[PDB]
Amino acid sequence: TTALVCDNGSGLVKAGFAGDDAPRAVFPSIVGRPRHQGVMVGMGQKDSYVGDEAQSKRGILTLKYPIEHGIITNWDDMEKIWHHTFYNELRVAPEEHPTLLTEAPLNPKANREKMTQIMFETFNVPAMYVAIQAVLSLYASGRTTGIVLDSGDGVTHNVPIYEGYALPHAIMRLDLAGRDLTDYLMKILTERGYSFVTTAEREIVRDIKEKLCYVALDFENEMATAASSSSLEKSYELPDGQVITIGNERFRCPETLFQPSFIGMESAGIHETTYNSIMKCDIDIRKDLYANNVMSGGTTMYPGIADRMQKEITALAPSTMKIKIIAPPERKYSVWIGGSILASLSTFQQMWITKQEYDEAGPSIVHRKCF
Amino acid sequence: TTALVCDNGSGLVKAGFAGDDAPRAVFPSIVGRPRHQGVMVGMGQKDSYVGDEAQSKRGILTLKYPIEHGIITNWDDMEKIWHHTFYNELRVAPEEHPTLLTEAPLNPKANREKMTQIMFETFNVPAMYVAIQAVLSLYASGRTTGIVLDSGDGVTHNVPIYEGYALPHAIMRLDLAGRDLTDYLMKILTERGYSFVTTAEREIVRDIKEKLCYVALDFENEMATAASSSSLEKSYELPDGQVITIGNERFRCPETLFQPSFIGMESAGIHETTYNSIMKCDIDIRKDLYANNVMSGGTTMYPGIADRMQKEITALAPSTMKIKIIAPPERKYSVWIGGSILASLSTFQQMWITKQEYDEAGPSIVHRKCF
Amino acid sequence: TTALVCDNGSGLVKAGFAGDDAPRAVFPSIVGRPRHQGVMVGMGQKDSYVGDEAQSKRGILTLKYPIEHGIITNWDDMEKIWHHTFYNELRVAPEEHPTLLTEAPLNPKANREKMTQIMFETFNVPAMYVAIQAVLSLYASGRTTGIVLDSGDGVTHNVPIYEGYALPHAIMRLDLAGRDLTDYLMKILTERGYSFVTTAEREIVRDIKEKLCYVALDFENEMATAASSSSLEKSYELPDGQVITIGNERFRCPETLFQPSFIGMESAGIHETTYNSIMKCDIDIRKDLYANNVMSGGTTMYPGIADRMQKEITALAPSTMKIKIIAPPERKYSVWIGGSILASLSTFQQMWITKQEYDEAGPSIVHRKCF
Amino acid sequence: TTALVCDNGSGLVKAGFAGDDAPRAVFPSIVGRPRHQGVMVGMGQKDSYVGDEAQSKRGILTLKYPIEHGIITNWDDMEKIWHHTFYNELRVAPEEHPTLLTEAPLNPKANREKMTQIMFETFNVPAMYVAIQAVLSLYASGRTTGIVLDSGDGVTHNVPIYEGYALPHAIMRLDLAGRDLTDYLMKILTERGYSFVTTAEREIVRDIKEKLCYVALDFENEMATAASSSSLEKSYELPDGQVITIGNERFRCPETLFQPSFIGMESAGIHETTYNSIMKCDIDIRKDLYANNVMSGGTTMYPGIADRMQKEITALAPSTMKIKIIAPPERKYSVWIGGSILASLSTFQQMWITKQEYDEAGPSIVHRKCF
Amino acid sequence: TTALVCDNGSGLVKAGFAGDDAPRAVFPSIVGRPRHQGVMVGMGQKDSYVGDEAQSKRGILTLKYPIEHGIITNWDDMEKIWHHTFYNELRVAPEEHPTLLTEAPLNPKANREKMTQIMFETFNVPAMYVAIQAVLSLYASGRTTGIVLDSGDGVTHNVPIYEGYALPHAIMRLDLAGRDLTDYLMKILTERGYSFVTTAEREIVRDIKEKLCYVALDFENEMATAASSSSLEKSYELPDGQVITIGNERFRCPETLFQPSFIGMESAGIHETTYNSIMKCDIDIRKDLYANNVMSGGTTMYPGIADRMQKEITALAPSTMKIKIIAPPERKYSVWIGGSILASLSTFQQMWITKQEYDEAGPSIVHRKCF
Ligand SMILES: Nc1ncnc2c1ncn2[C@@H]1O[C@H](COP(=O)(O)OP(=O)(O)O)[C@@H](O)[C@H]1O
Ligand SMILES: Nc1ncnc2c1ncn2[C@@H]1O[C@H](COP(=O)(O)OP(=O)(O)O)[C@@H](O)[C@H]1O
Ligand SMILES: Nc1ncnc2c1ncn2[C@@H]1O[C@H](COP(=O)(O)OP(=O)(O)O)[C@@H](O)[C@H]1O
Ligand SMILES: Nc1ncnc2c1ncn2[C@@H]1O[C@H](COP(=O)(O)OP(=O)(O)O)[C@@H](O)[C@H]1O
Ligand SMILES: Nc1ncnc2c1ncn2[C@@H]1O[C@H](COP(=O)(O)OP(=O)(O)O)[C@@H](O)[C@H]1O
Ligand SMILES: [Mg+2]
Ligand SMILES: [Mg+2]
Ligand SMILES: [Mg+2]
Ligand SMILES: [Mg+2]
Ligand SMILES: [Mg+2]
């Protein structure tokens, strides 16, 4: 009956039921294991902690992200997360519900294949489908045309969709994403004087990032004022009362998205990645892509990321071509929302890969129906 | 009662009702098919798009022209176009109306035969007639005598008609037409620095052609000034804001009509094709043909095509023989207009090929009444 | 069946049965030997006196503490104490009961090993386990998280435990403890005019300490008033009616815990030792450690030791971090209480080191299961 | 006296002296600039590295190709390459030798004009000539008739030459070339699981391409076996010992030449591009073109490219028309070889554009003598 | 004229003149202050003792290290050390000589800024430059390429340099260094039975470390034999004749570098830190980095540290990639040696920051020229 839409992203697992307007289970894609021995016999210690558990016990755990750059690496841990998603978070009996998973385009084929295997074998999922995140995001916006710039913790990518037709050859993938920005903060805060090192501390820095970082409209001018006044300087309270004072780093961090060279990344910034994608698309539709630049994913939650990108692309693109960026509230969950929509469509029911179908055809079936 | 005049030309389908002074359905003879896979399940994607649909979705379609050089090649697609012409554009029930189709003289007999078959079998058209485009054009001008130079996208041709009597033996057909000029622009713009390649881009170039190209009165002198000043240079805005600057090519393109060697065409130019046609006609009537040189069809919409041709023929033809070219406004639709007229004539009603008549006599009937 | 929990501490041997809410045998860790010859043949003189015997005959004995700074030095005497603990105090047949011993963290490995050897060889103890005192103390408080500041006669130490996970690397050990405070009184009372010298007199001074000493909230201000009025001055009756009048020394003594430099100890005071321990712990959990600072052990029985330390740490720690010190009644026996609890746990039964297991594996087994 | 034949191609600069049977200076058309800051003051760091320098320092450089799709874009860098070609590679004093450059047919006129300007102004080249690469290739084969399919890194093109007469109107140009195949590998290897992203990594992939890729005779059947056995799977060692295992991609990559749709290219594959060129040629000579299909350029070095194309064209072309493909050893350098030949011809000496002649006539002279 | 190269490291101040092959002033970065009151009026007591003074009077001093983890904390004391370095050790008039200071990469910007201020204001140093220690180390080896693993008392770090180009983004910093190993010995010796507590005793332990500690090639197998025989056991004489017997601890201590978890350090060991740095570097140059792994700094003076690391990295790195570690004699002073070299270079003279230049530009100038 009701599908379980499960946005298995590289940082936040967002799961819920198709038809919901929001995920019911949102928790981090983290599996943590006791950093230290353990002594209290009778404590009820666990071998591993998942999601919010890992968060609450974070300081004594080595925190691992099963997914890295969009690729599920640690399959054992990934399986654990899904286990919790279904049984402890949603508290739903997987075997009675179709599920919808997601991927970043251009992921390794084995990623989907192995993921598929698990859904059918471990969880006995009646029927299942894997959709491209960008595509789903576009469904959430309610558009059939646009550039979907989906930039999560794992990977940043641009998918051009025109009137329902994705344009594979112009899909851009840039591994520079939220996690890299977080690590860049760890580096840049060291410059300032704050030694964040552990995986727990990485996670603390993520919280910093999400509250202080913003995108300068004009980076260089911003730097000039940042190095002049203290108006930019903004304090932050850690878990420990040790207040952190951050200034330049508030925008130097997210600037990396536009100047990836900051982290030694050869690729051009996302404003040029997006632009170049559009250049790969046929002239006939470039105008429509320019006017429907849809941003989504958590890293697009930075203040002024839309304004900045509009400025950048406006400079890049033939003046006249009205550059319009769409960056709706709740775009952080747009992929999941898109999934809810998609799964609730009548037409879409024919896209399910059934257990039987899979058993018959074999693994290859999961590419046959999409990418 | 009212006939449907349907100028099934190689580029613009022009259909309407007999008695109208203009076609009601004018749209391009294009069938487009999804260049790329397609991903949005629930979009309501079509297997093929026709006419204005193909135009609007052009960049993601492979655009085919069913008709090439005046010959209907892709019969399946041709049928689709007629289907839309009748049911979606005119929104008329074919089976209640006689229809008038057109052909370029010297088309392959099977063209008309197969076309005929479809009208009677697919559309159940009460009665139908196929007329030569040039002849119709002359009706539109309201003349009984002249050279009809009908040059469309598909094919250029000269038909000599004298006081109602066509002179078959002097009919000239030259495949060099509008489509070739378009492709010549794609080549010549490459020289300039603009890589137009796709069928979508071909279509873009057609728009360029129709707005910038003009016919030099004296090609060589034009070249001299074109390579001297920048007064000729004229900008053009694509669908993409990428402004195109065009100069020499503005007249080198249409020059091909007078110097077909530019595209490797062995034939003499249209000014000599026309002249030669007249030479094939008996001396007794050459004077009248010279004074009634009727131009029609879209390629004769070039600025100065009339002036240039008058100059050319004047040089070719025995001075004294007043060369007069007729090139009325709306000559772009003269064939269709002629059809409207023809079908509305009382006399003409006896020329209809009825369903019954066809069924009895068989295919051959469609040549028995004309060419 | 019932385990014998035996807190073999450096000053008070506290033994009883698991499940009891208090030790049944509490007596001092002292072995005394006749200071003088002895003449009454027929008196029934002993070669050595132990515990309360040593107390009652104290003035004619050289009193030795087998344990010094947490380390069992005089193994022969230690064995004697255990002998009495079991057979004369508890009056229990060791060989029928599992026993639970304790240690200060970071004790020399040979301490536990030799202790273990004795339990199995001398007393034939079915099964035995050695636990860290701080850990046990935390069990007594009924917490899974906190800093355990256990400060006995022998050694002061800080163990950070977070949700059942001890954090070895942050364990602090400071040999400055109760015995040093006692000896500091002997020194400081000499300043006043009271020559306490013998081991018997040391023991007398311990009684002084436990009745008069208190912790100044603000040492320096305390000194000012102490050197101004006589309101602080407080009398004390010795075993000999010679009343002792003590003033400054009432708080200068315990002050050493916060200013170890008073006794030539290089280490920072316990308020900074505790703080530093927390600093060694990962930021993520420092807040919880601050709010669960558990004090235990006899030296924390000083009046105002909690108030003072709260003040001190509050100054050291980032304001906001609510510093909360736990210092429950009966914390003097918290280690023993913890042992009672621990041994009574069902889970814990698997932690016993059995005679057999020991015989097989050998000595190393006693570190393999903990520190 | 001796001319310098300099095949300034989009990937390998091949220069040498006329009369040589092989180029003396073969190095890549790459200009690299320090990706990272640089710290060793005293290292003798350069602002840019060219050719083999760029190769050796590749990982710390942003590698640019001055030429893209046959068009010299970065003129500054292009000039640098020529500078090195002459002075450091050949070690020849340009001003004493005539030079022969090459172009892909249908390049933008300004390409040749600007190139010309540089030869005369920067290098003071006595006399210079620019020849079409395809034409030269035919000279190398020693034929006067055939289709020259020259497919390099930049651009693929077909030139029909009949008994010394090139047939401009049938020249086909397809930007799909070696560089696109390389980038397609980067995409397809991502599917496999290998993230190649940087310009350095692009270059690594080129090496992969040139060693593993081969052309399936029957792509679809190849796929069937490739997805069945592991016999196709072939390992590759990177600069880093990280062995890469490649299977399907070994032929899916070069398949793009026959099915350009793989990279979103609208054009038909090279087998149809070639065929269509021949169709544009007059019937009278098509037979001779069929029997003299000369392949050259680096992309025709793929194993089985000849066999495959013969199969393809054989299917396309009227059976009877013996399709014979010429694909001689060293066809990779055939353009350069052709240049050596051409420049060494006595007749050819009259084709030189002299410095004086250029100065007098002006830029236009470089088109006046050819295309 | 002659520059003063002053390696202001966190443990040994190594200063001398540029051009020397060894530092003239090598003494510890220690400022000691009288632990105890002091009574001999007329002794000529000092308020603080520095370097070798502090060493000779160590037992009565609280020894402070101005620098901690590479960061100058106690600026007052740091200034004192420099004062002595210049005036009492080198006995040179600072104001006549340019000076070269050093830093660990990723130090807080204020470190360099404040340091700079002092050089110009306190010492009036004509001109001054601050260089990264790792870079200098590479100069000493005489290489332009390699991984520099510089591990001193304060901080361990990896800098990848390729042909003169440092690769900032791959620089690793690990605070686990010599001082932590020393403190780990204090902890581990406590296990053995030796209570080292004071700062003087810490310093004693450093001497132990430097004479007994060695790196096990295979830690676990080493443990097996260490816990079996007494062949490993090795005696040590303190300042006090109290011989210390050390066994397991001889290699358990330095093992921490490879298994930082021993001290609660979350980071991977230096063999993985190094490896990971190389992974961050572009594939193109990884081979060269593998073959030029340059170790330097005092902690790399452990016996077998090179052998062990080679083994470790060999396991980590794609077999084939010949792992070669460079660990030259005198690498303990390689940073200083590098400085001597650097300062003596002609090119390098343009890197000096002059007093004037600083006064004009202001503090920011010290980052503008490097990191
Ligand atoms: N308000 C915010 N501002 C900036 N970054 C954010 C914000 N919220 C989330 N992020 C970043 O977005 C990423 C997670 O969002 P999400 O797109 O759900 O990741 P994923 O889809 O990879 O699970 C993280 O890097 C997170 O730090
Ligand atoms: N204003 C114009 N200027 C130049 N060419 C035109 C113009 N309008 C139409 N054409 C050309 O005429 C051709 C279409 O006209 P039409 O005669 O209706 O073609 P067909 O009869 O072949 O359908 C196309 O090549 C079109 O580009
Ligand atoms: N009421 C008290 N006030 C101050 N100190 C006390 C008090 N009771 C006990 N002590 C001190 O605590 C130490 C003994 O307590 P305990 O923690 O049981 O020692 P241990 O565990 O070392 O045997 C002695 O120094 C004793 O003087
Ligand atoms: N053995 C080979 N197999 C496949 N491709 C090759 C081989 N050698 C060269 N190439 C490809 O041919 C192109 C370079 O050849 P070349 O024709 O000289 O290029 P250009 O003429 O554009 O400089 C590159 O894409 C190169 O990868
Ligand atoms: N022979 C040795 N064996 C082991 N460690 C050594 C040796 N010599 C010096 N060290 C350690 O190296 C550190 C000091 O070397 P150095 O690199 O000069 O430190 P820094 O550069 O931090 O001043 C100290 O921890 C010292 O103990
Ligand atoms: Mg996501
Ligand atoms: Mg027409
Ligand atoms: Mg105790
Ligand atoms: Mg070439
Ligand atoms: Mg150093």
Side-chain angles (χ1 to χ4, degrees), chain A residues 9-12 29 64-71 152-155 175-186 202 209 299 302:
Chain A
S10 61
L12 289 171
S29 299
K64 297 294 189 182
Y65 290 86
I67 303 170
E68 178 64 47
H69 287 314
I71 301 169
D153 193 64
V155 63
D175 289 345
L176 168 62
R179 191 168 307 170
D180 296 298
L181 294 173
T182 295
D183 286 1
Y184 186 56
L185 279 172
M186 292 173 76
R202 171 189 273 136
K209 189 181 75 175
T299 69
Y302 289 121

Short mmCIF file of all heavy atoms in Angstrom, two decimals, chain A residues 9-12 29 64-71 152-155 175-186 202 209 299 302:
data_model
loop_
_atom_site.label_atom_id
_atom_site.label_comp_id
_atom_site.label_asym_id
_atom_site.label_seq_id
_atom_site.Cartn_x
_atom_site.Cartn_y
_atom_site.Cartn_z
N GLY A 9 20.85 9.41 2.27
CA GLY A 9 21.90 10.33 1.91
C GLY A 9 23.12 10.21 2.79
O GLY A 9 23.07 9.62 3.87
N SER A 10 24.21 10.82 2.35
CA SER A 10 25.49 10.76 3.04
C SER A 10 25.62 11.71 4.21
O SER A 10 26.56 12.49 4.25
CB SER A 10 26.58 11.09 2.08
OG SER A 10 26.40 12.39 1.61
N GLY A 11 24.71 11.66 5.15
CA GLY A 11 24.80 12.57 6.26
C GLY A 11 23.51 12.63 7.04
O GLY A 11 23.55 12.50 8.25
N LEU A 12 22.38 12.73 6.36
CA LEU A 12 21.10 12.62 7.03
C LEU A 12 20.20 11.61 6.37
O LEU A 12 19.77 11.79 5.23
CB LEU A 12 20.39 13.95 7.07
CG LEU A 12 20.98 15.00 7.99
CD1 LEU A 12 20.30 16.33 7.74
CD2 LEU A 12 20.77 14.55 9.42
N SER A 29 23.54 9.83 9.34
CA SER A 29 24.06 8.59 8.78
C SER A 29 25.35 8.22 9.44
O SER A 29 26.39 8.17 8.79
CB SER A 29 24.31 8.73 7.30
OG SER A 29 23.14 9.03 6.59
N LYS A 64 31.78 6.96 12.17
CA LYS A 64 31.95 6.64 10.78
C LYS A 64 30.74 6.98 9.97
O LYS A 64 29.60 6.77 10.39
CB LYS A 64 32.26 5.16 10.61
CG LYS A 64 33.54 4.71 11.26
CD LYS A 64 34.73 5.36 10.57
CE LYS A 64 36.04 4.77 11.05
NZ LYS A 64 37.20 5.43 10.41
N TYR A 65 30.99 7.46 8.77
CA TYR A 65 29.94 7.66 7.81
C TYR A 65 30.06 6.57 6.79
O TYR A 65 31.04 6.55 6.05
CB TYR A 65 30.07 9.00 7.12
CG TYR A 65 29.79 10.18 7.99
CD1 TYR A 65 30.79 10.72 8.77
CD2 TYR A 65 28.53 10.73 8.00
CE1 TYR A 65 30.52 11.81 9.55
CE2 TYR A 65 28.26 11.82 8.78
CZ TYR A 65 29.25 12.36 9.55
OH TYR A 65 28.99 13.46 10.33
N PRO A 66 29.12 5.64 6.72
CA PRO A 66 29.05 4.55 5.79
C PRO A 66 29.18 5.04 4.38
O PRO A 66 29.81 4.39 3.54
CB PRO A 66 27.68 3.96 6.04
CG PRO A 66 27.43 4.26 7.45
CD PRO A 66 27.97 5.64 7.63
N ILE A 67 28.58 6.19 4.11
CA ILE A 67 28.60 6.78 2.80
C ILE A 67 29.62 7.88 2.69
O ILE A 67 29.68 8.75 3.56
CB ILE A 67 27.24 7.33 2.47
CG1 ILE A 67 26.21 6.25 2.59
CG2 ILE A 67 27.25 7.85 1.07
CD1 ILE A 67 24.80 6.76 2.52
N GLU A 68 30.41 7.84 1.64
CA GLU A 68 31.42 8.83 1.39
C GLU A 68 31.35 9.30 -0.04
O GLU A 68 31.44 8.49 -0.97
CB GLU A 68 32.80 8.27 1.69
CG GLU A 68 33.95 9.22 1.42
CD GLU A 68 33.91 10.44 2.31
OE1 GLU A 68 33.73 10.28 3.50
OE2 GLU A 68 34.06 11.53 1.82
N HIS A 69 31.14 10.59 -0.24
CA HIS A 69 31.05 11.17 -1.57
C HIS A 69 29.92 10.57 -2.39
O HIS A 69 30.03 10.53 -3.63
CB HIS A 69 32.37 10.97 -2.30
CG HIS A 69 33.40 11.90 -1.72
ND1 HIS A 69 33.25 13.21 -1.45
CD2 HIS A 69 34.69 11.58 -1.35
CE1 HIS A 69 34.38 13.71 -0.94
NE2 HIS A 69 35.25 12.71 -0.89
N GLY A 70 28.86 10.11 -1.73
CA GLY A 70 27.72 9.54 -2.41
C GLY A 70 27.80 8.03 -2.56
O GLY A 70 26.85 7.40 -3.02
N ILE A 71 28.92 7.44 -2.19
CA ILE A 71 29.10 6.02 -2.38
C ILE A 71 29.02 5.27 -1.09
O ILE A 71 29.70 5.60 -0.12
CB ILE A 71 30.45 5.75 -3.01
CG1 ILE A 71 30.53 6.47 -4.34
CG2 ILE A 71 30.64 4.26 -3.20
CD1 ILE A 71 31.92 6.48 -4.92
N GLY A 152 24.60 18.04 -1.32
CA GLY A 152 24.45 17.54 0.03
C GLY A 152 25.77 17.50 0.74
O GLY A 152 26.69 18.23 0.38
N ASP A 153 25.86 16.65 1.74
CA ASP A 153 27.10 16.47 2.46
C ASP A 153 28.10 15.70 1.62
O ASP A 153 29.29 16.02 1.60
CB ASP A 153 26.86 15.75 3.78
CG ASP A 153 28.03 15.80 4.75
OD1 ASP A 153 28.37 16.88 5.18
OD2 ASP A 153 28.57 14.77 5.08
N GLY A 154 27.63 14.66 0.94
CA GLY A 154 28.49 13.80 0.14
C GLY A 154 28.95 14.41 -1.16
O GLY A 154 30.14 14.55 -1.40
N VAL A 155 28.00 14.71 -2.04
CA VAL A 155 28.37 15.15 -3.38
C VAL A 155 27.46 16.22 -3.94
O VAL A 155 26.27 16.26 -3.66
CB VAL A 155 28.38 13.95 -4.31
CG1 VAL A 155 27.01 13.37 -4.40
CG2 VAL A 155 28.86 14.32 -5.68
N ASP A 175 32.64 16.19 -6.38
CA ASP A 175 32.71 15.61 -5.05
C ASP A 175 32.84 16.65 -3.95
O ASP A 175 32.43 16.39 -2.82
CB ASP A 175 33.82 14.59 -5.01
CG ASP A 175 33.44 13.35 -5.83
OD1 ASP A 175 32.28 13.21 -6.15
OD2 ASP A 175 34.31 12.57 -6.13
N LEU A 176 33.34 17.83 -4.27
CA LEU A 176 33.28 18.94 -3.33
C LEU A 176 31.88 19.16 -2.81
O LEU A 176 31.00 19.62 -3.54
CB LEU A 176 33.76 20.23 -3.97
CG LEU A 176 33.46 21.49 -3.18
CD1 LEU A 176 34.16 21.44 -1.85
CD2 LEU A 176 33.92 22.67 -3.99
N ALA A 177 31.67 18.83 -1.55
CA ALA A 177 30.36 19.02 -0.98
C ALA A 177 30.44 19.42 0.48
O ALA A 177 31.49 19.86 0.95
CB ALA A 177 29.59 17.77 -1.17
N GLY A 178 29.33 19.27 1.21
CA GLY A 178 29.23 19.72 2.58
C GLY A 178 30.29 19.18 3.51
O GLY A 178 30.81 19.91 4.34
N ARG A 179 30.62 17.91 3.37
CA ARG A 179 31.62 17.30 4.22
C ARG A 179 32.98 17.91 4.02
O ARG A 179 33.80 17.91 4.94
CB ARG A 179 31.71 15.82 3.97
CG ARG A 179 32.55 15.08 4.99
CD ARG A 179 32.37 13.62 4.85
NE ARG A 179 30.97 13.29 4.89
CZ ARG A 179 30.44 12.09 4.61
NH1 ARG A 179 31.19 11.07 4.29
NH2 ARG A 179 29.14 11.97 4.66
N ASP A 180 33.24 18.41 2.82
CA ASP A 180 34.53 18.96 2.53
C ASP A 180 34.59 20.34 3.09
O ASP A 180 35.63 20.76 3.58
CB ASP A 180 34.75 19.01 1.04
CG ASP A 180 34.80 17.63 0.44
OD1 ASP A 180 35.66 16.87 0.79
OD2 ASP A 180 33.95 17.34 -0.37
N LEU A 181 33.47 21.02 3.06
CA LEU A 181 33.38 22.33 3.65
C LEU A 181 33.59 22.24 5.15
O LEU A 181 34.27 23.08 5.72
CB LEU A 181 32.03 22.94 3.36
CG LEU A 181 31.78 23.24 1.90
CD1 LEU A 181 30.35 23.68 1.72
CD2 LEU A 181 32.74 24.30 1.45
N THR A 182 33.02 21.21 5.77
CA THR A 182 33.23 20.98 7.18
C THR A 182 34.68 20.77 7.49
O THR A 182 35.22 21.38 8.41
CB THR A 182 32.47 19.76 7.69
OG1 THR A 182 31.05 19.96 7.59
CG2 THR A 182 32.83 19.51 9.13
N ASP A 183 35.34 19.93 6.72
CA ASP A 183 36.75 19.70 6.96
C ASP A 183 37.60 20.91 6.66
O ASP A 183 38.61 21.14 7.33
CB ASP A 183 37.24 18.51 6.18
CG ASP A 183 36.75 17.22 6.82
OD1 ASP A 183 36.06 17.30 7.80
OD2 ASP A 183 37.10 16.16 6.36
N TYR A 184 37.18 21.72 5.71
CA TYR A 184 37.87 22.95 5.45
C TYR A 184 37.76 23.86 6.65
O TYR A 184 38.74 24.50 7.00
CB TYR A 184 37.35 23.62 4.21
CG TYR A 184 38.15 24.82 3.83
CD1 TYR A 184 39.51 24.71 3.62
CD2 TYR A 184 37.53 26.03 3.67
CE1 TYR A 184 40.24 25.81 3.25
CE2 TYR A 184 38.26 27.14 3.30
CZ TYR A 184 39.61 27.03 3.09
OH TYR A 184 40.35 28.13 2.72
N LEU A 185 36.60 23.91 7.30
CA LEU A 185 36.53 24.64 8.55
C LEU A 185 37.48 24.13 9.59
O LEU A 185 38.10 24.91 10.28
CB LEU A 185 35.16 24.63 9.17
CG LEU A 185 34.18 25.61 8.63
CD1 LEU A 185 32.82 25.32 9.22
CD2 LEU A 185 34.62 27.00 9.01
N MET A 186 37.61 22.83 9.73
CA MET A 186 38.54 22.35 10.73
C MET A 186 39.93 22.93 10.46
O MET A 186 40.62 23.40 11.37
CB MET A 186 38.54 20.84 10.75
CG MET A 186 37.24 20.26 11.25
SD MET A 186 37.14 18.47 11.09
CE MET A 186 38.18 17.94 12.45
N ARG A 202 34.79 17.11 14.50
CA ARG A 202 34.29 17.36 13.16
C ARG A 202 32.82 17.65 13.18
O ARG A 202 32.35 18.62 12.57
CB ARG A 202 34.54 16.19 12.24
CG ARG A 202 33.86 16.32 10.89
CD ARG A 202 33.93 15.07 10.10
NE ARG A 202 35.14 14.98 9.31
CZ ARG A 202 35.89 13.87 9.19
NH1 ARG A 202 35.58 12.78 9.85
NH2 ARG A 202 36.95 13.89 8.39
N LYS A 209 29.30 25.43 11.29
CA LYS A 209 29.08 25.72 9.89
C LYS A 209 27.67 26.13 9.63
O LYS A 209 27.41 27.17 9.03
CB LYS A 209 29.40 24.49 9.07
CG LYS A 209 29.42 24.70 7.59
CD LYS A 209 29.72 23.39 6.89
CE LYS A 209 28.51 22.49 6.91
NZ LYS A 209 28.74 21.24 6.15
N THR A 299 23.55 22.04 1.54
CA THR A 299 24.55 23.08 1.43
C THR A 299 23.98 24.31 0.77
O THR A 299 24.55 25.38 0.85
CB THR A 299 25.75 22.66 0.64
OG1 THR A 299 25.35 22.52 -0.71
CG2 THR A 299 26.28 21.34 1.16
N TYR A 302 22.98 27.75 2.87
CA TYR A 302 23.79 28.89 3.28
C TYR A 302 23.11 30.18 2.91
O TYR A 302 22.55 30.31 1.82
CB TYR A 302 25.14 28.90 2.62
CG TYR A 302 26.08 27.86 3.08
CD1 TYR A 302 26.58 26.98 2.16
CD2 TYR A 302 26.45 27.78 4.39
CE1 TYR A 302 27.45 26.00 2.55
CE2 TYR A 302 27.33 26.81 4.79
CZ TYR A 302 27.82 25.91 3.87
OH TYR A 302 28.69 24.94 4.26
#
